Scaffold this active site. Sequence first.
Site, mmCIF file in Angstrom:
data_model
loop_
_atom_site.group_PDB
_atom_site.id
_atom_site.type_symbol
_atom_site.label_atom_id
_atom_site.label_comp_id
_atom_site.label_asym_id
_atom_site.label_seq_id
_atom_site.Cartn_x
_atom_site.Cartn_y
_atom_site.Cartn_z
ATOM 1 C CG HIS A 99 0.139 6.337 -0.310
ATOM 2 N ND1 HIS A 99 -0.918 6.901 -0.989
ATOM 3 C CD2 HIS A 99 -0.376 5.830 0.836
ATOM 4 C CE1 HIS A 99 -2.026 6.742 -0.285
ATOM 5 N NE2 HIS A 99 -1.724 6.094 0.826
ATOM 6 C CG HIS B 218 -5.797 6.617 1.046
ATOM 7 N ND1 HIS B 218 -5.781 7.439 2.152
ATOM 8 C CD2 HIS B 218 -4.723 5.801 1.169
ATOM 9 C CE1 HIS B 218 -4.739 7.137 2.906
ATOM 10 N NE2 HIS B 218 -4.081 6.147 2.332
ATOM 11 C CG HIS C 94 -1.713 1.263 1.395
ATOM 12 N ND1 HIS C 94 -3.068 1.349 1.158
ATOM 13 C CD2 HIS C 94 -1.327 2.494 1.808
ATOM 14 C CE1 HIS C 94 -3.481 2.578 1.406
ATOM 15 N NE2 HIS C 94 -2.444 3.293 1.802
ATOM 16 C CD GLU C 95 1.604 3.304 3.761
ATOM 17 O OE1 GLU C 95 1.816 4.481 3.401
ATOM 18 O OE2 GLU C 95 0.519 2.932 4.255
HETATM 19 ZN ZN LIG Z 1 -2.321 5.188 2.573
#
Ligand SMILES: [Zn+2]
EC number: 3.4.24.17
Lengths: 165, 175
Positions: free
Chosen positions: A123, A129, A119-120
Site C-alpha cells: 500500500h 487490494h 502487504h502494508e
Molecule cells: Zn490492505
Amino acid sequence: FRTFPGIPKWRKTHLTYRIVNYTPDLPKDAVDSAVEKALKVWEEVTPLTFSRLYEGEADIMISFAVREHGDFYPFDGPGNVLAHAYAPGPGINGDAHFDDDEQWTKDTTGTNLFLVAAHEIGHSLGLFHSANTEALMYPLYHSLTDLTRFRLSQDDINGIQSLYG
Amino acid sequence: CTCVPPHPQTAFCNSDLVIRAKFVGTPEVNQTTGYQRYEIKMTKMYKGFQALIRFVYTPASYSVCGYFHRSHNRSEEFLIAGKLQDGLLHITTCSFVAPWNSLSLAQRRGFTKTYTVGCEECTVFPCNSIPCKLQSGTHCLWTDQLLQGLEKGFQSRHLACLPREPGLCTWQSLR
Ligand SMILES: [Zn+2]
Ligand SMILES: [Ca+2]
Ligand SMILES: [Ca+2]
Ligand SMILES: [Ca+2]
Ligand SMILES: [Cl-]
Ligand SMILES: [Zn+2]
C-alpha cells in the site's frame, strides 16, 4: 506530474524508511528483520531501493500503536484490523501503522509481522487490494503453513511493475 | 489494510447495529474527516434500535480499511454489522457486510434469532495456526481458514458458538 488523475506512486526510485517505535511482542532485531524482508519482497521485482533512517522523518514511517494514535483511523483492539498504511505522498502518506493489540510473531503461530508488513508496504508503494486470494495484496490475513515457500503472486508483481517498472 | 474477518456471530455480538439495507448511489468522500459515506435504505433492523439510518460511513481509501461496495444492483439487500461512533454507523473492510441472499439459512437464523444466545458468554476464537490454543471453556476455536474455508467455511456458515452449561461453550448447529 504529467498524467492526471495521478498515479499513486513515489516519484523517485530510492525511498527511506524508519522504524520509529517497536512492539514488545518481539525482539527489536526480529522487528527489523521482518521489515527489511518485507521491503526486499518489493525490491527484487522493482527498481525501488530502501535506506533505513534512525532519526528525522523518512518516506515510509513504520509505527506500532494501539487504538487511537493520532490519525483519522483508530485501531479496534485485538482482532479485525491488524494494520493499515497510506498511499505515497508527503507526511503521513507512505506510513504503515501496526495494531499492537495483536501479538506479532516471527513465525506463523500468531500474526506474522512480515506477512502483514509486506502487504502494508505494498500500500505504501501505491498498490491497492487484490481480488486474488493468493495475492499478497489480498486484504484478509492468510497465515501460511511455512514462510519458506512464500511467493509474490503475478498479480502483485504486475501491479508493482506497472507502477515502477 | 490487513483484516482478520470475524465470524458472523462475533460480528453480531460486537456490532452496535445489525441491519439489512440497500446501498443507493455512489459514495461521497470528505477529506476533512478522511471518511466516505454511502446512502442506504434500511429495510430491516436486528440490532441497534436506539439509533432509530440513511448513511453508512467508512474510511476513504483501501489502505486504511475503507469499505468499497462492489455490487451494481441497487435492489440487492445487504446485511451490515457496524459500530455506532458519534451516532454514525461505521464499517470497515473487516466488517461483516454480505449480500443477504448469499448467506446460508443457518447464518440468517443466527442473525435473526440464534447468535444473540451466545453473545453474553461465548467467544469465537480465530485460529491462525495449528496447534491452536484454547484460552477458556467459553471459547470456540474457529478453524475454517486453516481448512481454506474463509467466509464460506462450515463453522461460519452452519455453526454458532453456543453455551452448553455455565462455563462451557461449544460449536452447535443453527437449524
Ligand atoms: Zn490492505
Ligand atoms: Ca485490531
Ligand atoms: Ca510518510
Ligand atoms: Ca502485542
Ligand atoms: Cl507521470
Ligand atoms: Zn494509523
